[PDB]
Amino acid sequence: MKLSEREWLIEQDKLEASGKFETCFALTNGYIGIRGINEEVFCEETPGTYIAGVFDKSTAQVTELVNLPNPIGLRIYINREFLNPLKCEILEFKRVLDLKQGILYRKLRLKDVKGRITTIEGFRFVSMNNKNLIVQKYDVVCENYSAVLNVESFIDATTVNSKDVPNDRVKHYEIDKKKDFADGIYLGITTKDKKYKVGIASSTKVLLNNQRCYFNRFTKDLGYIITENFEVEAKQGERYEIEKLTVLVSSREKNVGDVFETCTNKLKEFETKSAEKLLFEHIEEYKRLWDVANIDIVGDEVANKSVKFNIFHLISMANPEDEHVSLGAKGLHGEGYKGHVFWDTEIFMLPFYIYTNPAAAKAMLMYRYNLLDAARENARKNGYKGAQFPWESADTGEEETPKWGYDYLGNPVRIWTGDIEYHISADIAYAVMNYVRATDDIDFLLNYGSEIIIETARFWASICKYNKEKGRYEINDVIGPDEFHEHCNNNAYTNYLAKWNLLKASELCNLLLEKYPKYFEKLSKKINLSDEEPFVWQEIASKIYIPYHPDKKLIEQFEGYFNLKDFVIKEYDQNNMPVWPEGVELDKLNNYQLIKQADVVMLLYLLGEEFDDQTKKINYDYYEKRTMHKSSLSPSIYALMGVRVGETNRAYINFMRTALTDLEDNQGNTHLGIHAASLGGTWQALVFGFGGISIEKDDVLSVNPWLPEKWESLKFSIWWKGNLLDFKITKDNVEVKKRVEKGNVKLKIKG
Amino acid sequence: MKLSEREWLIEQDKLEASGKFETCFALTNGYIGIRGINEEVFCEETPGTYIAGVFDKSTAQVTELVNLPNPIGLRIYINREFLNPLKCEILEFKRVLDLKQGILYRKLRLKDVKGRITTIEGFRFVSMNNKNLIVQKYDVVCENYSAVLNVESFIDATTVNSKDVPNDRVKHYEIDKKKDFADGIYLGITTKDKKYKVGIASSTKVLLNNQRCYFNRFTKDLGYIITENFEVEAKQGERYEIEKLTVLVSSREKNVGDVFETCTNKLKEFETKSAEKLLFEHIEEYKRLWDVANIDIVGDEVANKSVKFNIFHLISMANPEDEHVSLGAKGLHGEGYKGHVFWDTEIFMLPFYIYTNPAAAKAMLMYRYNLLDAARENARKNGYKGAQFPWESADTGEEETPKWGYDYLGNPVRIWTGDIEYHISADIAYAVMNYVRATDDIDFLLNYGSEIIIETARFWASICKYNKEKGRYEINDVIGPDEFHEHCNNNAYTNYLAKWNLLKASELCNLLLEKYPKYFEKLSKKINLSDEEPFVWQEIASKIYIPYHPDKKLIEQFEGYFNLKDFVIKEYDQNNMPVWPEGVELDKLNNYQLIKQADVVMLLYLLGEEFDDQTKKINYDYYEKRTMHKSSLSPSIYALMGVRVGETNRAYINFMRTALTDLEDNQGNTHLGIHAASLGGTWQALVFGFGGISIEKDDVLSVNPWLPEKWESLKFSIWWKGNLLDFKITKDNVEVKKRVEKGNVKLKIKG
Ligand SMILES: OC[C@H]1O[C@H](O[C@@H]2[C@@H](O)[C@H](O)[C@@H](CO)O[C@H]2O)[C@H](O)[C@@H](O)[C@@H]1O
Ligand SMILES: OC[C@H]1O[C@H](O[C@@H]2[C@@H](O)[C@H](O)[C@@H](CO)O[C@H]2O)[C@H](O)[C@@H](O)[C@@H]1O
Known about the structure:
The structure is a homodimer.
Chain A: E1 9-12, H1 19-24, E2 27-28, E3 32-34, E4 49-51, E5 55-56, E6 64-65, E7 70-78, E8 81-82, E9 89-98, E10 103-111, E11 117-125, E12 133-142, E13 147-156, E14 173-180, E15 185-191, E16 197-208, E17 211-212, E18 216-221, E19 225-234, E20 239-250, H2 259-270, H3 275-293, E21 295-298, H4 301-316, H5 343-356, H6 358-369, H7 372-382, E22 404-406, E23 412-414, H8 417-420, H9 424-439, H10 442-463, E24 465-467, E25 472-474, H11 492-515, H12 517-527, H13 533-543, H14 600-606, H15 613-624, H16 634-644, H17 648-659, H18 676-690, E26 694-696, E27 700-702, E28 713-720, E29 723-730, E30 734-740, E31 747-748
Parallel strand pairs in A: 27-31
Antiparallel strand pairs in A: 1-9, 2-3, 3-4, 5-6, 7-8, 7-13, 9-10, 10-11, 11-12, 12-20, 13-19, 14-15, 15-16, 16-17, 16-20, 18-19, 21-28, 22-23, 24-25, 26-27, 28-29, 29-30
Helix pairs in contact in A: 4-18, 5-6, 5-9, 5-18, 6-9, 6-10, 9-10, 9-11, 10-11, 10-12, 11-12, 11-13, 14-16, 15-16, 16-17, 16-18
Bound molecules: a molecule of 2 linked components (BGC-GLC) (2 copies).
EC number (chains A, B): 2.4.1.230
Family (chains A, B): Belongs to the glycosyl hydrolase 65 family.
Organism (chains A, B): Caldicellulosiruptor saccharolyticus (strain ATCC 43494 / DSM 8903 / Tp8T 6331)
């Protein structure tokens, strides 16, 4: 294994427990996620072991992605004394995430209190090609001594969720079985709700010039921990190779009756291959993914590197073979928001996959399709019609948002997002349109897509309420993208998005009636669709209260917003993030005009075609002045609309905010997991902002870049109606190369 | 609670995990022992939770006293973040063991990274009067802030034995039950061999001016840990009282059918009393014990304090209500030698109890009596007769010595002590005589004592082998007190001790035949004793090969010893302990004349009446020159014989060695547990050495002091035939005060 080059490396400086690097160094393959802890598992680290879709409620407030037993532990002992890296003199330290090869690397040269010197060097990864597999390989040298080493692999089943919060700790599994099967050790568990079973088998061994060299292997069952141990008569200066493979299998996979037999079998297979061979296969997969998703920026090193980071995690975490899971707000990298799926996924993350690797995006939309029944059921129980998707979603598709939590002052506060942040249903509809238009995946549109757009439209129809006074439908008592303001009327974003969803749906019925009548009838039997309905949605859409006002040009975020006390940002913190104006009480945010994130501006981005350059700029200017960027969702939208109204400084400032979200820990809480929307925002800003990509009405791809001065060039690729397109953007012109063909496609350049 | 005065306090300087203070601060009441860890249980501490007599083998090499779940844990949280004392600025630290009151105390004033300042102050103890009880009480003040505190009591069932040695870790119990019974939390376990069950119930609560002030109590079952949590709205500067009682109960106690009900009931009772009330009762017990066992030294502060330490642990660890356990080589303070009972107990520890609190010594001898069947069985299986007590003894009375371990170079070595260190059987006999002579407990002698002395004599008779050449019985292929030399012939100590045991036994038969004929027949039916036997023992005793030689005067430690390569101590370490002469190979100790500890000199101490002042001094001088003091048993014997041959410097040097054994960590391994023999050696040296107590043939107590110059005075008390005697010893004369009378007793002063 040779480390990649440096533009490709992210480096931790000090050897220590780190919440931030636990997150930034999390590895995942879309099924398994492993937090970036050190191998020895220091007292203070917070391990994370997840498997997509395995959730549990038990005694907790809401269901949660389960922190499983931690399987990666590895410790060294010299004559039965544990070589503790934290109790040594660190002569050399290197620790980097290699983004090109998708591995985590560590080299250590240590000097213990008895003056012995040992180097430990190697890496781990979570196979991109083999979804159940995790691979570790470390090399040990005793530099100036001989001894008996014990190499201790272990699986630790004391892990819990919410480790550091005494009120919220829960253990979400129980152990079913522990076993030394000679070839490895096994531990398997069942969730407390009894819905999933997971099995973990693992085999370590120790070589010297490729031949097994341990004189003794023993095993220990200490109740909640099982260990596999290898004793070596180690000779000064020799190179001992440690190789540990581990397999996770869950009840979520197919024809897995006995997780114990499935694991052992699987491991037996993977063990016919070396760690190098498995790494090579791993890397081919990363090649294949980067070959399309990589994005070179010339002339800004900190940005090129940063963006690579964002993109890495994006390509690591989606698994297109899985149509029953999607991406939670923090990936598979942490327990923030507990693995729940938000609009984050459909609106911020999904575009990367649509243009980058559209199969992934298809699977993520399958996740929502498969939970239509739960969205219907959710609407029924609130008194509505259609599919009302929940604000937070897990495995079952029921609403999973907490009824309460802690505000910015650490006090209890009611949470109403799960009750009245309705826009989620439109955003999903929107994302179905958005996937389809880029892919021309008509089959998807016919069998799945249109049901979704139609069933959400039925819901918006149900909640729109008519007002004779102003002679317009309203949607009242709501929360829009700006979570700071609760129980409002006619949130602009909400109404346009509702309008949009009602319209697309009537238009879709027409398309299908005329151009696809067998499919329209398949569908009509299925969801009782009558061709009188669409007229209803049109009637409603045409009267939904949009507020302008014709001149003045300024979109009120919601009725009454302008009557609210006004504040002026001024003052930024060391990460260039807004600081609370003075006199703002953090639990009275309802009273002020400061906003948490893009809301009206969010509207301008997604419904670009409805607002002219001037309305965009007027509203962009009014709201940026007033955005606190208290979600990681925010900067990217302001970077992208920045460029689009031609304010390229505001833009680059805001871009550097989304790109550095976790690497500089902008928001103060990277330790809870990767900020996954922010990753996709970062990508969106590059491609649809600075790269000047956009979509003209009749589905013509336009390009219309606007590099920040500072960047000599920008290449990225994307997939457009089946065509894989490489753009290179210089300050002057734009190159274009169709690397894969499917029909002739219309492109429309600068200028 | 007011701390005692200072002469009475032992203090740890730095706040840290410490193997040594885990030992030195271990608290016990003779049934329960708790290692001296801090309440929070830091990553690196080694907790110890023992109950006398509960042993388990499971997958281990030999049976072991079980480290039970750890019940004392207590942590504080501020707004759900754990207040970690190791991650704070320590503004004040006090931690002392108070030897007079028998409690462990800690005051902390901390400043956490958010600048909050909190003081935590209180103590714990293991009730001397109530054997199942442990008490903790801490006071919390938030100095400069208000918050929600969580007070977290917990019982941690992840504990194992041999925590730091990967080859030897075993978990010796499994959990049977966990329970929140509203009034507390419960966890109970069963040993893996299935011989003992233990239950632990525990109840915490939190007061403010004596009234319950937590607004919420919740519980958590995290599998191998259960917690009880108390939430308080804490006001700046208020004094929150935390009080946690905990109860251990085991299957070893009587009419304990359901350990769960017995614990809960017990706790319910103890909870009708406050921590102060329980402390007061605790202290009365310590008063009562110290009132007799205390020993004032005037004019050497470091010695007075030290001796108090030694005596404290002695009075803490014996429980005279228990006739089925005795004292293991490391008390109930650690897992060194795994709670096994050696001659340490009978010869070094027992004298303290005989003279200090003779009921204790009676119970310890009951331990051996009750295992006579196992000692018979042990002799039979080696081809011998009588009772052959094992070298290491646990619950069953079978031999428990390891077949192998690691030598001084960390390599595997065969251990033969369990096969051929036979003297143990004599030492026990001896201790029975020794208890009886001080106590005049004739009843004990008749019903129990004499069986023991007789059955061991039957064994010595069986192993003595006749030699026609020298016309003497020999005992060959042996290990004597000096473990350095293996497979030797006619170890001097062994032969005199055998002779002694054969003689006492024939003499005892005579006493009983003549003066107690009903008892002699009770006994004779019981162990098939014929009045022909004693003649056999006499015949043998009179020919046992004693080596002199008439002039020269020097007792060869064993046949051939003088032909061994000779070395010269020279050079002492920073604790004034011998350093290995150069050219000595630590795994070839058989070849040299260096000895591990008192052996011939051991003989001079126990059989004083058989050697004259000159033979004593000649042999003392020859062997001290050559003793490495590589057991903690050694210094004390050399301090005591020092004074007795009149070498008072050698004496004070050696005394300061035994007294400082654990407080200065002389032997390098205090972390494994208190060196319990060394405690009793220390006492023996004071009383029978410097205090000049001795026993003239016809059981007259003589006094014949010899203070080191430096010590103005020395008072100690002792019990002699039922009379409690206070001696005060000055450089000039000796005062004496009978505080309790039982007949007139002969005393014989200086001079
Ligand atoms: O990325 C997740 C989510 O984060 C922010 O809002 C959170 C809200 O959606 C959630 O219901 C509550 C409780 O779980 O926490 C809020 O902070 C963000 O504002 C939101 O738009 C985003 O999707
Ligand atoms: O205090 C216990 C014991 O310690 C020393 O000897 C140990 C020996 O008795 C034991 O069999 C082996 C293995 O457990 O370890 C030895 O170090 C001491 O020499 C001895 O006299 C003493 O009773």
